[PDB]
Ligand binder design. Sequence first.
Ligand SMILES: Nc1ncnc2c1ncn2[C@@H]1O[C@H](COP(=O)(O)OP(=O)(O)OP(=O)(O)O)[C@@H](O)[C@H]1O
Ligand SMILES: Nc1ncnc2c1ncn2[C@@H]1O[C@H](COP(=O)(O)OP(=O)(O)OP(=O)(O)O)[C@@H](O)[C@H]1O
Ligand SMILES: C[C@@H](COc1ccccc1)C(=O)n1nc(N)c2ccc(F)cc21
Ligand SMILES: [Mg+2]
Ligand SMILES: [Mg+2]
Length: 1179
Amino acid sequence: MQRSPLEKASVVSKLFFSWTRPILRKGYRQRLELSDIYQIPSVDSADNLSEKLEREWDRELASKKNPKLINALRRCFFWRFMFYGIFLYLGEVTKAVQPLLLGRIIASYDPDNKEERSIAIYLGIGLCLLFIVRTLLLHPAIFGLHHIGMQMRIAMFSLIYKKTLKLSSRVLDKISIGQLVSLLSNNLNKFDEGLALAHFVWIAPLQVALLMGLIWELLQASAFCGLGFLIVLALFQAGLGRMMMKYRDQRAGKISERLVITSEMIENIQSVKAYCWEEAMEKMIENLRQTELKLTRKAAYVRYFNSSAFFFSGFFVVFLSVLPYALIKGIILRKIFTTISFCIVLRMAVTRQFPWAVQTWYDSLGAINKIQDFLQKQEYKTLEYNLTTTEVVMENVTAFWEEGFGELFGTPVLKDINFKIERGQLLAVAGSTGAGKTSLLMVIMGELEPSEGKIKHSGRISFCSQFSWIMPGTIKENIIFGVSYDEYRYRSVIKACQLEEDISKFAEKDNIVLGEGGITLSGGQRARISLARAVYKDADLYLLDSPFGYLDVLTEKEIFESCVCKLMANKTRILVTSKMEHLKKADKILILHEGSSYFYGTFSELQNLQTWNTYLRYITVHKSLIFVLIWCLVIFLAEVAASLVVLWLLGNTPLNNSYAVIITSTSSYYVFYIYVGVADTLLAMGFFRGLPLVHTLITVSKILHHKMLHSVLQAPMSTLNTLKAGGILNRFSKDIAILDDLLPLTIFDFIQLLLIVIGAIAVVAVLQPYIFVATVPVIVAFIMLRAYFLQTSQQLKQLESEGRSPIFTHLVTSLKGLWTLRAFGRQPYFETLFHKALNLHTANWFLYLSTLRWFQMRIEMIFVIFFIAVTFISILTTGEGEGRVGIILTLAMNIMSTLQWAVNSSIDVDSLMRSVSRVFKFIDMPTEGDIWPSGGQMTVKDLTAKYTEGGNAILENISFSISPGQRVGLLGRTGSGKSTLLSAFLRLLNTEGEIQIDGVSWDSITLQQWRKAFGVIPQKVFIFSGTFRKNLDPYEQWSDQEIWKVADEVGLRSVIEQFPGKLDFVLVDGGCVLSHGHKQLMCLARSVLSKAKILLLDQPSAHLDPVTYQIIRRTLKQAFADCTVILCEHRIEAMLECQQFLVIEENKVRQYDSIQKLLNERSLFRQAISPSDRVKLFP
Ligand SMILES: Nc1ncnc2c1ncn2[C@@H]1O[C@H](COP(=O)(O)OP(=O)(O)OP(=O)(O)O)[C@@H](O)[C@H]1O
Ligand SMILES: Nc1ncnc2c1ncn2[C@@H]1O[C@H](COP(=O)(O)OP(=O)(O)OP(=O)(O)O)[C@@H](O)[C@H]1O
Ligand SMILES: C[C@@H](COc1ccccc1)C(=O)n1nc(N)c2ccc(F)cc21
Ligand SMILES: [Mg+2]
Ligand SMILES: [Mg+2]
């Protein structure tokens, strides 16, 4: 990584941006490769800014009574803000006095002998130097302002992340991903680019005053009437501005809901596609989009009228400012022209520079105060005592989940529990489902505040949750988890959890690539990775929270009698089990039941007791756009014809008449100038030509989003597995926020500027031909630069924009699995691992900005050089009478200013349309594309499954047959592909082989009609945000009587009744309110509703107790009376019912008709069954 030459650069390079040149030199010819990007300047490393801002912030917190963040931000950046403000003030004043020189230079052309014929050269010199000072003084201030904005935003983001770790657990459920992702996404670009207009809040007044003086020297007593009209205009403008903000704070409440639905949708699309939930999800998403569109539509209309104020107030202001004086005394055309040339600047400085400045100030303060509110949130205070007697004590505790019951003190989820544990002794807390075992572990963690009672243990702790969590990276890094690696300890850990065979099964031996959460791995490997992590880290206390669920039985006995009982035989271990073998081995027992310590003691006591293609694809996608554009062009043609006839009539005029004092020496070259000064009004857009354009643009954005989603969802899984979660969150947030908010106005402004320039040039060329030849050497000079620039930026924006994802995809995981992350106490590690991604995105965005500002330098210097040459050639070549050529040049380069503005707008439009390019990238994704299920008799021949195209053999040469209504139980040691075969039944992943189902095959039936025959309860439960009734059946086919009768079969009464909204309670954060077993029962009910003839059960009993499990087998007898069942269990007890057994081994299936021959065939499997079940199998 080469160090940025910004640190090593001369002052001329910094004031001219000559050091950016190597990037464009490398980029214009060949595509950018990923070493050319410079390392960030040492100033804007996240650490320095974060430390500076946090020190100022916490000192300000300590000092003041009501701390405010904005005071610390001021104390940090105000000086380098004002040092730039003075330069911007000078560089905008230098636009007030330019028309002063310009008017007299224009006055010289007139043959009658004015004194100006001597001062013409001095005026030209002053004008030349004035332009060069403007160029050297304006842009560097803009770049520095953008740089300060960037630094501020970086420090704020790092502070946000530093807060989102110490955030108290009781608040997490309230705040979902939507708030945070919106608060970063909306800020990212707007708050950075918006610190160039922060000054124009106090620049606009002064400038206006300075203008209202000079115009007053021209116009004695009508400039005040013009100013009154302008003040009315500014009040109307601020009124529209206030109206618009009320139409955003009602959208920002639902953007988060749509974002969270989309994230939950795409993270586990596995179950979504398995269930054939395609249309209901689209209906819900578009239902949200409808309201969001109404709000965006109204906001867009309001924003449109705001924009037109410049373009359609120009004639009105001048008319009402020069009617009275002309009426009373008359006007020489010099007065009218200089009034126009001042009125342009006045219009600009009090129509699009004041209101946008106050807008950006309102919005920046709103975001800052929202962040300040965020930082005022309850902090989880830790009392982990390093001093202890190596003895863990817990006494008389009770806990409350929601804070209201906490303060008001519904039963608590615990009460009056107590235990005491030595060092070297193990507890085994076992509870029937819903008792609160995980809640007890959380209370031991202190993450739940005990409403009353006493806790004490060592400060050295480790954790292994019920639900696994896998941060993206290598298995080696994921297991070590930010510790100095060791050969011997790591090898011992891998020897205990017996990961050796599975780790040898992968292509890369030890370290592979795991995505967010790691769908790439199975369930057993994931749980055992988590357990290995909990074993590796060294501490005085261990909280293993039921890691023995997602495994077979032989692996269970091996791991439990080599790792828990043998490897770590001296260090305290809390164990959550549901097998009598553990309790027999257990040293003390605490059996919970419904939040009550139902039994405590010892097992002996227990026995005793009992790119231009996108430019077209965007437009042609909807016909309304083409119609609007065509009709607008026709209207413009009519308008330019009207202007043509007006100038034709006034050209052939045959001239007491003091209405307009006009003379032949002045007329022929002042009428054209004065018309071109008012071109932007006669060619403006009214409320009859503009509104359809904005409406159609918003409609097109909606259609684009809908198509993008419908193409993402039905995409094949092999493609989907490659892309991350950030690569969808980033898109669905930013690349639709842009297509809804910024584009439908920026493209409109571009259309307007292009249209105005074209019309003015056309009409003036028609009346004066040579001006065309006078302009062309500049326009062809313009595009030549633009086409050279775009190649750099056209390739760089992507290289930066995708760089956003390493932020979001790192924020989600840390937030998703915050609990273990804070459990081990590894905050600094993730702090640095986030700062790295932030510095990456900076190394992209900063250099992109430093290239755009350079192109502004170059474009305005092209204009200035042309302008200096024009003024020199023209004034010098003025003759004793009727100087002609100078008029021809100066009119052209009066047009050139607006044309340059149009070029800048065009660059901005392209930089935004990158977003539409990226969305069309997603839309081009491949497509996986009497009662039929009579008996369900199934036949599979020569099946094999592949995850990646041509990948390794996960299965090979499978074939079997299932008679109708004969449940076959499938089993096999973990990591052998049981879920693989279940998934490959649905041909989700790419397949090979042929299946006959009661006289039909795969080919003879369509895909969607094929998946209708099955019903699935996947290994990964799936609960989005919504109500119970909507969650259980989004299609809404069945009455609440149906739901209520099923909800007693599945034994869900005691879960619905305790919750306030029976079938109408809202669910948040993926059902985090519910437990695990309740989620399992919920999904099983969701499969009972969809009565399918052939059904696949993928581990219906994951962590359930021996008691509640009865319901499972219960709903297997009366409920599924005859339906064919593909049941994939691990607990051997659930295999007593099935008639055939399919054992999966060595990537092949072997079927047997019984159990005895199976078990004698594998001797090592025999000694693993518990005696209570071994007697059941062998009578
Ligand atoms: N995050 C939560 N928010 C609200 N209530 C909760 C939450 N977690 C648990 N509960 C309540 O606590 C009870 C069980 O707590 P907990 O989740 O610890 O049981 P569990 O051991 O996970 O259940 P299982 O044995 O099925 O795993 C449930 O009745 C549930 O209503
Ligand atoms: N999403 C995935 N991407 C790549 N490979 C996968 C993926 N899922 C599974 N595999 C491969 O399939 C094998 C295990 O398949 P599968 O997940 O069906 O086992 P399993 O029976 O589900 O395990 P368990 O007993 O934990 O349920 C592993 O070797 C793994 O490499
Ligand atoms: C599109 C117009 C609508 O008005 C008319 C349309 C046709 C004819 C007459 C009037 C507009 O929006 N205008 N016209 C202004 N003179 C103006 C000033 C400030 C502002 F915010 C908007 C403004
Ligand atoms: Mg649990
Ligand atoms: Mg499984």
